[model samples]
Every structure is written in structure tokens, then in C-alpha cells.
Target chain A: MAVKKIAIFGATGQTGLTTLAQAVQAGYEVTVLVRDSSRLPSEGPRPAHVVVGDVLQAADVDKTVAGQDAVIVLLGTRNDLSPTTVMSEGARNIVAAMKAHGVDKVVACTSAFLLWDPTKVPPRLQAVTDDHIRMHKVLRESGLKYVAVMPPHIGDQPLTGAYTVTLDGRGPSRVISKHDLGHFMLRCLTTDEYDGHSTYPSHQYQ
Target chain B: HMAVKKIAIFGATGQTGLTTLAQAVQAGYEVTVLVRDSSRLPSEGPRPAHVVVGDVLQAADVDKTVAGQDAVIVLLGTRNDLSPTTVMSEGARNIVAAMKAHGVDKVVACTSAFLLWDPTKVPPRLQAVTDDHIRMHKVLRESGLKYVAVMPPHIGDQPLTGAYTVTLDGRGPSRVISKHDLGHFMLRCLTTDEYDGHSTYPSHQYQ
Candidate 1:
């Protein structure tokens, strides 16, 4: 059995924290890159390594991504500025570092709203959609084995381990638990079925 | 009558890039370049290439620049910042994508000679730069395109002697190469199939 090494960017976010905790509990060597280490959960078992740096900075991203088997990017921004370039820039750095270090597998988090019809998306979410679109473009162009995990409306619920994954743009569920999202992302590390596709993992309702 | 081959340059503002642009134009090859800011280029001079103002990080910009070119010469360089950055690799990725989309095949990219040799043999101060070059090289190698990773030693300001030595490894006559010679070699490789398929040719100034 091989020890899987995973690097997590944006591990301080809601879904990212769950992924970190679950990744550590699953007996994987986990590394998290955070701007503020203090923001990470101090109450429970921690990751094997906590690197402090900004994702936008190439040096910092390289440090975090080096010597990893796979990377999970959950980058999120607070600003709603039009034509956001942070995610796109960050994706470029991540892809570059991964290629340099020979780490090929990457599962990045994006919004499912991006796959939806533009006329269906509200005006308030247009900026984020544009950013995700750019990020997706970068990932698609990047010559690496990558999977874009697109989940719509993450809910505060426990891990059900029961969800429906849609590869195409047909009949995607509305909401998904963060824990389930994290589990699906981890599962994608070893699975080749989702390679080079936009995966939508939504919660299964009764 | 066969038409002259067309070429596109990525780092047209850099030292070797400028030299290559000038030489390509002088050699009567149609050339195009994507520049971030035209101000960085000369305002008034013997300019013969078509200039497109844009950044390499943008796919659209690279697509427009790479369209309808027979080959591409990538002379991407980094700033003095020692920090690890993906500017070079990102630019290479963008260029490769654009080339694949536009159906262009050949690419000749420049990197430091230190990357083809042992790191211990290189200066400690240049470790960071070498690391960046290594990354860019990996991107190009994995691009699956016909490429020549040109590794030139310290680029000097000497005039074009039209003579230089090419070595596979770091073993060369001199550690310094003239910018003109390097540019000339890049353009030569574009039309020739002598160096292809992830080939790294270390060039040096010859007597």
C-alpha cells in the first residue's frame, strides 16, 4: 500500500477545512497552505504540514505543492470585483508548480453556476461566474491530469456518503454537504473516470 | 513559388528575443509578437514585425498572436526576483495551447544552460533561476509538440560573429554566448529538423 500525499490550498475555507480534517483522518499525509495558520482548527488532529503563504504568490504555491502526489485547490475570494483575475492567476501558478515538481493530479473546486446558463444566473453572481470561467480556461489549457469539482450551494450538513455525481450538464442536484464534497474530491485522486471533466456531486434527497 | 516561412515570438522585449526579432526581420521572414506594453519596445527604429499588445497569461492574446505562424520562438525571461514564479511556465503553456489550436508545430524555447547540467556545478546564487527554468522545460517537454529547448550560456553583448558551438551537455568551449549568435541559432533551428523532439542544445561563444 502506498502512502498518498495530498496538498490542500485554501484549507481555511468551509469545504477546505472539512477536506483537511477528513484527509488527515483517512491516514493520508496532508499538507495545507494557509495565509493565517491560526485560522485552522486547533481543536482536532492537524495536518502533517501547515505552510503559511498566499496562493497568488508563485513561490508560496511552489513551496506548498512540492513533493505532493496530488493537490486540491479550494481557492475562494471575498471581493466581488468584476473580471476577477485571482483564481485564474492562482490556477496558473498551481499548474506551473505541479508541472515543475512532477505532481500531475489536481482536483480544483469551482462553482456549478458556471455550467448553468448565463441567463439563468443572477446578476450578483456574474463576477464569480466570470472568474470561474477564466479559471476553467486555464485548467483546460494546462497540460496536466486535472478534475474541476463543481458543486452548487454547499449546505451545512453531515457526511451522508450518498450523493449523485453528474458528469454532463443534465439533471444536477441543487445542494451538497461539504463533507460529501470533500469525500468525492478525495476519491477523485485515485479515480481516472473524472479526469478532464467537470464533476457535479450533489446531495441525494429522500 | 514557395512562400517565405512565418514566425511568431513570445518574449519579443527580452534581450535575446529582440535580437531574434531583428534578425528574423532582416532574414525576410514575416514575424509577429505579443508584447505587454509597446513602451517597453523601441518607439522609433527599424521595426518590421507586426506587434500585438497583450500579455502571455491570457489565452486569447496568445491565440491571436500564434495564428498562421509556421513556427514559434520562445525567449521568455524572468525578472531579478529570486522567488519561484510560474511566469515562464505559464507563458509556455499558453504558447503551446495557442500553437495546438492554430495548428502550428515547431517551437524553439530558450532556457539557462545551468538546467541541462548538474546544479552543484552552477553557482548557488543562480539556483532559483535554474529551478524556474527546470519548470518551464518540463512544461515544454510535456506539451507533446515538436520543440527545441535551447540552452545558452551567459548572453554577452558581442556582435554577431555568425559562428558558435553547440553541445549536448554543459561541456562547451566558453561559458559566454553573444545574443546575436543565440538569436541566429534559434531562427536556424526553426526551419531545420536537425534538432527536434525535446532536444536541448547548449550554445557557447566560439573563437
Candidate 2:
């Protein structure tokens, strides 16, 4: 039980929010860092603490990471999806904060399409993939116990509860429930085994 | 004919390797196995053409086994110790070096089928093994040898069927393949060009 106090990033999204709920249920003291408090369901699965600030701000990310046992990152674009470094920059700052706070483990997510050749990636997903690639680079060289997950086609569905995963950066049957993704992220938070791996999770569908 | 007749097998005493070694002998190839303890090898069935009593970690021992061999099969692993070790990676490096020194042409290696997917998706139980499997793959890839890293899922203990499906490019990873069939494919790849420099995935077609 090395991880009792947890800090979760991107707590407002469907995936991160699901993770927040699961973490709280698992009996971990959870603190969620979000830009807007309203984004979190005001009445459901409230985190023990909420810090309303941007992940890009080193000050805010540091505040959330400090005094935590582990970290979970599921940040995505905010108010904009057009090509940007928010994911990577946020990830860089988060890892830095975790290092400063002596938190060794952080479970983070990016698109599984990051596994594909950049030239062949669809035009629509190019920006996200590009940003995710940057984020992956940061986690890879961060020297922290970081599990960088790249899930395929995060479907807005309930947990199938059981899914198949691969370790070689290839998933063709691309579809995993957001809940499943969130649950896996929390598992990554506690399991040091996922550290130093670029793995993907997916199944056909529900 | 420049066919591969003499082969060296690393990990011949393990579950998957024992089946493969038996198959190699039945196929009329001269098989050499390197083991620390000769008693660990199969006492019955197809026996190795030669058993070099030595360690896979030792270069001279690997050299003795690799010398004059036309091909190599690496099924080296920690056998579920999962205590975070690089035995597979280190063994692969030794084999690669021996292959180069002895002018061995091709190597067909057995890494976990989990290697065919993203490592994170692999259950935590196999994290340590897969971690080294990934490292072993990198060594083979950079070796510039005609290596087929056979990625098999849920290697079963069923009898040899020889009817399993193999994705030579590791595209469609399936679940569960008989160890005999897995060993069969490793030997099968030694004489083929389709799987060269590819990560192949083998699974039971019936399931």
C-alpha cells in the first residue's frame, strides 16, 4: 500500500472522472486538479480536494502533486483541439512536479494512434497524435516511474470489465470503454509494473 | 544447397524449448542444446544432436554452440520468476554476438505474444518478463540478422497440432497456441523468408 494519497489530473473528463470515482471507492485520498470546478460533477464522487488551476502553470501542478503518494494524468485539450502543446507541456510540468514532490509513479494516457507511423495517421487525428507524441517523449525520458498508456478509440461506453491488451504498440481492434481506460489508469497508479512501458488497450466493442 | 541443417537451440530445457527441440530432431535437423545441467534436458523422446554443458551467459559457451550452426533458435526466458530481471536480454545479446562471430544467418526467437501489443495492456503479472522481452527484441532488431521474433499468446500445453495460424507480420494476435505448434513455427521460420525481420504472432486457429 505504497500509494494511499493520490493526485489525479484531468479529473473533469469522462475517463479521468471515472478514475476519480474508482480511486475514491478504492479508499485512496484523492485530490483532483482541474481548471474549472464546475466541470466536475458537483454532486457525484467528489474528490477529497480540488484545485482550480491550469496544468500548464507549474505553480498549480506543483500544488496538486505535493503531498501525494501517486499521480494519474489524463489531461486533454481545453476549449481547443487545434494543434497545441498543452498535453505535452502539461505532462512535462506534471512529471517535474512529481519529481520535486518525491512521487515516483504517474499513470498518463495519450492516443493509441501514437503507435502508428506519423505519415499514415489520419488527418483529423494528426494534431492530437503530434501533441501526444510530444507528451510520450517527455514521459519516456522523465526517469520517473511513469506508465504512458496509449489507448485506442476511447468509446463512450460502460466498462466491459474485461479487455485484451498488447505490449508492442499495436492494437487494430481499436475500441475500449472510457471507464475501462480510467480504471486501468488507476491500476497504473498503484502498479509499478507498468513503468517504462508504452502499451495499448482495446477490444472490438460492447 | 545453402539450407540450414545445423541449428543451435537456447533454452532447450524449458517448456516451449523442449517441445521445439523434439520437433527439430524429428525434422532431421542436427540440433545442439546448451544447458548448465544435462539432467535438466528431456530424458526421453527426441534428443539433441549435441548438448554443450555450459551457460547461456557465457560467450565462449555460446560460441561453442553457435559455431558451425546454420541457424539459432532463442526461447530464453525467466520461466515466470517475474522478479524484474534481464536474463532474456542478456542471453539474446550473447546469442547475437555468437551468431555474428560464427556467421550464423538467421535466428527465430520466441518472445511473449504480449510483445505484439502495447506493454501496458499486458497484465501486471507478466510485466517483468515482457519488459525484458522488449529489450531482447531491440537487440535482435539492431543485430541486422534475419530474425523472426515469434510472439505467441497463452502458450498452451496441448499436443502438437501444427495447424495454428501465424501472422508473420504480427498483425492479428490471437489467444492460446499449443507449445508444440509454437516450436513448430520457430523451426518453420528458419527456412522461410516471409517472416524474416518480422515479429510473427502464432495462435490456435480453432479457438
Candidate 3:
């Protein structure tokens, strides 16, 4: 098989680490796109590369995305925790950079609340949920080959070695684990089954 | 003159669009479908008064198809629902532009329920599903069209039961269960003099 080279943004965060581990274990040539390369884990199994860049800076994103087969952006920003513009602005930079670099394949992480269907969610968290919907708008019209992974509230659990994928309000039911979510993200990197689709990983409560 | 209100449905082949077509027809409105072909339509429906072949992304196609409609129901969805794409936002832009060109006002669209006030006890899994809908809401709100956004819950393929509650800005604990129920809400909003350029959510009340 031809060597598959993948680059992941947000490679130091909780979910980023999990995705990094999965990519490395899967034997893909992995690169961690970071704002500060020093923030990356230097010990343990080293990543194939770490390109330093900020997601919100267009020039940085352009530089970071150069010569990569595909990019997976797991960028996140909390309304209460950071500037409200981070998620949308960062995504815009990535989109702009991708277009400029002629790299179209992108698998991004977005909240599930961006969906147009809402009958499935319980009442409450609607305000925060709406924020994600806003972020999705920026990515939708970004004009890139994008796959959005909308996982439910991620849990810090071991990989169950199982997951489910649905498109277009398929589930008004269940939550999924972070490990399985990582698995799903990796699946998106190489699978053509879900190209240009947003997938959700939900699990039935045991 | 008792001319039936002419309603046009974009993307009439998808789940929500098909539901909108059926409900509008049942509600005694003259319906037109702006789609690639009438062949993709559901097996049952007294065929729409007119089926115009056109693409939603192209403004000319939308203008050609939507020129004579009284109201336009933009029930557009992507081939993949969970993934975010320009099918709705860009398509709405075309529809809005066509409406502006033709001077038609009423535009009823379906957005996610989570876009409004957050619920307290929502399952963590369904939490982030409102992102794209809310983003599109911003665009719709600014379009200067007489817009009515219907926010519903998980839309199942069940029979319409006529038992759903509509809220202005937020919803109660009850999730909008069936696509039929959602269709009922969208169609009812069409001629009802209740809401104008506002968003409504239909949910079942938790007992």
C-alpha cells in the first residue's frame, strides 16, 4: 500500500492526543500541526512531523498545510472559556489555506448541535448548542472537501472497539465514547463511504 | 377570488421536503416542486401542479422555478444530514434572491431546535447537533424576507398525530418525534396569521 500521510491540527488536546495515538498505531505517516511545536509530546513514539502554526492565522495555516495528503482539524473553542470567534475564525483560516494550497480533503470536528433537527435532544444546553450550529455554518460554505464528525458528548473511556455512523438526523438517541470517536475520525481519513458527509457515533445505553 | 395559495418546495425529494409537499397538498395549497425530476418524488401525491427542473445553487434556475409561487418552503437537506455543507445556506441565498427578484415574501425553513435556548437535561450525545442550523439562521434573519423557521426534534417516519406544541424562541421538554408532525407544523405556519419573520419549535410536553 502507498504510504498515507495525514496531518492533524489540535494535536495536543485530549481528543487530539487520542487521534494522534490512533493515527500512529494505524501506521499512517502522521504530522501534528501545532501553534507551538514545543507543546507537543517529544517523548514516547514520536510523530512523523510537527508543523508549527496557529489555526486562526491564515499565513500560519497556509504554511502548516503545505505538502500534506489530508488534514484533520479537531480545533475547538468554548464560548465561556475563550473568544467566541475562535471556532469560526480558526475554521475560516483553515478553509482559506486549504483552498490556497489546493488541498481539498479535510475531516473536521464539529459539535453535533449544528444539525437542523432537534427533537432528539432533551431540554437545556440549547444556548451552547446553538454556538456549534453557528460554527457549522462557516464550515459548510467553506468550499472544501470536508467531512464533519459530530460525536455526542465525548467520554474518556477505553476504546469499546465498536461504533455507529449515521447521516441526516438518523439518531434521536444515544451517546458515544471518545475512543470510538477517535476510531471514527481515523476511518474518515481513508474511507470513501462518507465523503462530504457529517457522521455521528452514538451508542445505546447499556 | 379564492385562488389557492401557491407554495413551492425546493428539494422535494428528501425526507423533510417530501413531508412538506404532502402536508401542503393536504392543506389545500397549490404546490410546485423545484426538483431535477418528478420521477424521484414519493409514490403517492396528486402530482404537483408544476415540477420545474432546476438546481438550487444557480440563481437563474431558482428564479425560473419560483417566479409564480406565493410562498416558498425551503426544506433542503444534504445527501448526508449530519455533515455540514452549503446545500441549505447557499440554496437559501438563491431562493431569497429569486424571491427578491419576484417580490414574493413568505419563506418557511426548517432549522434545528437546539439553536434556541438550551435545555437543562439534554443527552450529552445530541448536544452539538444545532451548529449548522444556527449558522443558517443568522443568514435567514438578515435576508429581509418574511421568514418562518420551524425547529423540530428527531423526525421519525411516523404518521401525523396533530399533537404538537409550538414555541416562539425555545421549546419544552417534549421532542418533535415524527417527520409527519414536523410537516404539520411547517404547513400550519404557512397560512396562519400568528408568526411573522420569527422561529417556532414544536415539541411534545413531557408528562
The DockQ values of the predictions, listed in order, are: 0.01, 0.02, 0.06
> Model-by-model lDDT, in order?
0.80, 0.81, 0.70
Put down candidate 2 lDDT per residue, B1-207, tens digits, no spaces.
258899999999888888899999999999999998999987888899999999888989999999999999998878534458888898889999999988897998888776766554554435777888889999999999888888886665667888877776665534567788889989888777888877888876432
Best-performing candidate as measured by DockQ = 3
lDDT, model 1: 0.80
Q: Name the TM-score of chain A in model 1.
A: 0.93
Tens-place lDDT digits, model 1, residues A116-170:
7645777676656656776776787787898988898888888978888889563
Stretch of 10 with least lDDT, candidate 1 chain A? A77-86
Docking class of 2: incorrect
Residue B51 miss distance in model 2 (angstroms):
0.5
lDDT of 3 at A79: 28
DockQ-best of 1 and 3: 3
Compute the lDDT for candidate 3. 0.70
- The stretch of ten residues in a row with the least summed lDDT in candidate 2 chain A is A77-86
Q: Which stretches of candidate 2 lie over 4 Å from their true place?
A: A1-206
TM-score of 1: 0.52
